[PDB]
Ligand binder design. Structure first.
Ligand SMILES: CCCCCCCCO[C@@H]1O[C@H](CO)[C@@H](O)[C@H](O)[C@H]1O
Ligand SMILES: CCCCCCCCO[C@@H]1O[C@H](CO)[C@@H](O)[C@H](O)[C@H]1O
Ligand SMILES: CCCCCCCCO[C@@H]1O[C@H](CO)[C@@H](O)[C@H](O)[C@H]1O
Ligand SMILES: CCCCCCCCO[C@@H]1O[C@H](CO)[C@@H](O)[C@H](O)[C@H]1O
Ligand SMILES: CCCCCCCCCCCC
Ligand SMILES: CCCCCCCCCCCC
Ligand SMILES: [Ca+2]
Ligand SMILES: [Ca+2]
Lengths: 255, 256
């Protein structure tokens, strides 16, 4: 029963109640640069705008609680990120890009304590990340990963290392830009949450950072502001660098 | 509270890391009688389209303001998303054929109006946008002002949702000929099993479509689910296209 424990939440016991995995938000954004050369096969690409509506849905699905003892769970998750040219009525406001991220995993709610920090989540599983397109906009990669989440007072730190498995023919140099792990830091400043999510490949010099700030405006809606800077904001832009700023609303933050 | 009442659920305060569902949430593997290659001929991969597809629906309710118009009312929003995915079509890099995005803003009320055995439980008024996220020439969209009314009686649930089309429907001008002005939903609780039927019919044109389903709990959060769709308007790109589609897979929540 811990703020930010995905798995501890999933263990909690009516049947019309869904569980979140990651953050759920809808924001209005502008990017520094639109990647028009990657989406050149789309008819509307020449007239693509830098202002878009960005949103993420993310859900956890407990399938088997107690598979490996009282504090474990066989679970699934689904994260979806979409970039939508709403203001671009000239081209019938199309979606530029969606990322679909299903996962299947074994999760453990833990309490290992070291140096003031408490390891709360240990999660191991399969991750698929694709963009739902055909050639040549198709982008896709699969990962075996471990997610480890620890908290210390107002801090939350999450490390997610992975191993790429299978084909990456659509984007074979993706690990050059994405790296082999993802770091997440949350900071709780009163009821406000400062957040940072990113990757850095130290042998290639590539990475990207997502910084955010949210605060409850009501007991229903949080205000949320986001900056993304770097490579790999979306699969179609994994090898593309830009800076994006957005404002909007959020249900859940990382803790 | 009451099984099947979206509004009654939305009024229950909870732990802020719990979402509310609006419609059903499911993931099924499907085979259609006919794939509408014609409508999607603009896509490079259209002629190698395969009749087997993954279909899934996500649907969430978002309480914005409880008590806006009294203790049993709510200002809310919903988002329903349906996707058809050519998973098996590795030859074309398994693209999505079609997604429908259905955001709503509404005023809802939890009621207790009993009449001839049936108890009206949900009264909902709001705005609906239904788009496919495409550009010319595959773009399909329509806006609607609707009322949703849900009533129950023993093992039965009946939901009627009549609407009024508003604004331009320039991507699909004759959409009302295949969809109609209302949607009917019937749920039946047979033990832990749920029979469901969801449909529309235009009496003046003879066009319609129906979706029948059966689900059974495997666990407290997961159900096995089978679906048959038959008729017109399964998706926006197929509003004027007739097909029969059968699917099997898993479900979180059924209609009650
Ligand atoms: C924090 C949210 C950013 C607000 C910026 C949104 C409005 C800017 O919109 C801009 O209009 C231009 C011409 O009219 C387009 O060509 C640009 O690509 C578009 O970004
Ligand atoms: C509520 C925790 C009771 C204190 C016993 C936990 C032992 C952990 O040990 C220490 O605890 C301190 C907090 O007491 C931390 O600041 C130290 O850095 C940590 O190493
Ligand atoms: C039995 C002691 C109860 C009083 C605990 C107050 C001490 C606050 O100390 C806190 O201890 C936590 C537990 O290790 C650490 O995680 C925090 O980082 C630390 O500051
Ligand atoms: C989102 C549109 C702006 C209107 C603000 C909605 C106000 C929140 O509304 C209400 O606040 C009450 C007091 O905390 C609670 O008792 C309710 O459960 C909550 O919904
Ligand atoms: C059971 C809840 C529905 C979850 C939908 C996830 C489907 C994964 C999509 C994969 C796209 C490439
Ligand atoms: C919390 C996330 C809600 C997402 C709302 C998306 C609305 C998309 C409309 C696109 C149709 C063309
Ligand atoms: Ca693909
Ligand atoms: Ca459109």
């Amino acid at each position: 029963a811990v703020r930010g424990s995905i798995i501890a939440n999933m263990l909690q016991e009516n049947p019309f109640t869904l569980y979140p995995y990651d953050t759920n938000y809808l924001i209005y954004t502008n990017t520094s640069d639109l990647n028009k050369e990657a989406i050149s096969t789309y008819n509307w690409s020449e007239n693509a705008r830098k202002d878009e509506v960005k949103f993420q849905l993310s859900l956890a699905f407990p399938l088997w609680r107690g598979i490996l003892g009282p504090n474990s769970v066989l679970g699934a998750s689904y994260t979806q990120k979409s970039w939508w040219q709403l203001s671009n009525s000239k081209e019938s406001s199309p979606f530029r890009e969606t990322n679909y991220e299903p996962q299947l995993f074994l999760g453990f709610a833990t309490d290992y304590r070291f140096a003031g920090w408490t390891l709360r989540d240990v999660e191991m599983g399969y991750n698929h990340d694709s963009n739902g397109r055909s050639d040549p906009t198709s982008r896709s990669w699969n990962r075996l990963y471990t997610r480890l989440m620890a908290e210390n007072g107002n801090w939350l730190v999450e490390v997610k290392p992975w191993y790429v498995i299978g084909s990456t023919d659509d984007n074979p140099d993706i690990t050059k830009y994405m790296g082999y792990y993802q770091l997440k830091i949350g900071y709780h400043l009163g009821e406000a949450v400062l957040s940072a999510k990113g990757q850095y490949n130290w042998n290639t010099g590539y990475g990207g950072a997502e910084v955010g700030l949210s605060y409850p405006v009501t007991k229903h809606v949080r205000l949320y502001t986001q900056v993304y800077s770097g490579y790999g904001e979306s699969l179609i832009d994994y090898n593309f660098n830009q800076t994006r700023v957005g404002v909007g609303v959020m249900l859940n933050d990382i803790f």
